[PDB]
A paper describes a structure:
To aid our docking efforts, we solved two EN structures by x-ray crystallography. Previous structures of the wild-type EN at the time this work was completed did not contain bound catalytic metal ions. Since the EN requires either Mg2+ or Mn2+ for activity, we believe this provides a better representation of the electrostatic environment of the active site for docking than the apo structure (protein without a metal ion). Our previous attempts to screen compound libraries unbiased by AD2 used the apo EN structure and resulted in no compounds with in vitro efficacy. Second, we expanded the structural diversity of the compounds screened by using the structure of EN bound to Mn2+ instead of the apo structure, and were able to find additional inhibitors using LeDock and AutoDock Vina by screening ZINC subsets, including FDA and internationally approved drugs. Therefore, we used the structure of the EN bound to Mn2+ for docking of Groups 2, 3, and 4. For example, the structurally analogous site to the EN S202 is the APE1 W280, which decreases the size of the APE1 binding surface relative to the EN. In our molecular docking experiments, we included the full EN DNA binding site (area used for docking is shown in Supplementary Fig. 1a) to maximize potential interactions with candidate compounds and opportunities for specificity relative to APE1.
Author numbering: 4 to 238
Write the structure that this text describes.
């Protein structure tokens, strides 16, 4: 009674510890997503083979040379994903996987933007990947930036760089899917102790044409990381 895919995004804050990988493996099994986007694996390109998660053996990774950044898209053993293209960031800040599930195209960009210059860094990735964006695109991960005023407890208006980022997303027919489903949401995914500020810096952005297929979306607090996850249910 179940042909809905669920895609999940989570900044995990490092996966070099095997015991930590087992906690993530159990958590993923509980959440039972079809597709899983992880940020900050902290796995070097040498160590990517260490990432094993029972039940999610299709794993696509982009990593740098230090124990820094690192992203991964995991696909459930129960989901038939046929890939056509995988594009990896050399520094491990993003990976794009294109393919299909059950004859329907899906383009997933998993992104981990740097703390500094985040909206400009994302705008540049969009430009670099311009030819690969389409109307079946999901962009999810740790943008390290609000996209609109309610993504921060301070309710500060977004900066010019963020505004230029949103214009570029608009040119690609991409929307903030979470806030379109929950326009007055005041939920958060990260807490900054130096300023006692709460912010939603993790995002699910996607093609306008996918909106009708998005059933549910919600945030998931956890004991694994300094970020809460976000889950999307798709038709
Ligand atoms: Mn971290």
């Amino acid at each position: 009674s179940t042909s809905h895919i669920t895609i999940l995004t989570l900044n995990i804050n490092g996966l070099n510890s095997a015991i930590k990988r087992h906690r993530l493996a159990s958590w993923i099994k509980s959440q039972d997503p079809s597709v899983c986007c992880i940020q900050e694996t902290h796995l070097t390109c040498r160590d990517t083979h260490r990432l094993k998660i029972k039940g999610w053996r299709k794993i696509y990774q982009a990593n740098g040379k230090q124990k820094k950044a690192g992203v991964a898209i995991l696909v459930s053993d129960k989901t038939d994903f046929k890939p056509t293209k995988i594009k990896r960031d050399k520094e491990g800040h993003y990976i794009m996987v294109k393919g299909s599930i059950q004859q329907e195209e899906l383009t997933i960009l998993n992104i981990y933007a740097p703390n500094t210059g985040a909206p400009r860094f994302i705008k540049q990735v969009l430009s670099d990947l311009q030819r690969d964006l389409d109307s079946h695109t999901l962009i999810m991960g740790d943008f390290n930036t609000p996209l609109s005023t309610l993504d921060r407890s301070t309710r500060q208006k977004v900066n010019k760089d963020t505004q230029e980022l949103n214009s570029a997303l608009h040119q690609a027919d991409l929307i903030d899917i979470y806030r379109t489903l929950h326009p007055k949401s005041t939920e958060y995914t990260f807490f900054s102790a130096p300023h006692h500020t709460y912010s939603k810096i993790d995002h699910i952005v996607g093609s306008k044409a996918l909106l009708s297929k998005c059933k549910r979306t919600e945030i998931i607090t956890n004991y694994l990381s300094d970020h809460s996850a976000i889950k999307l249910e798709l038709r």
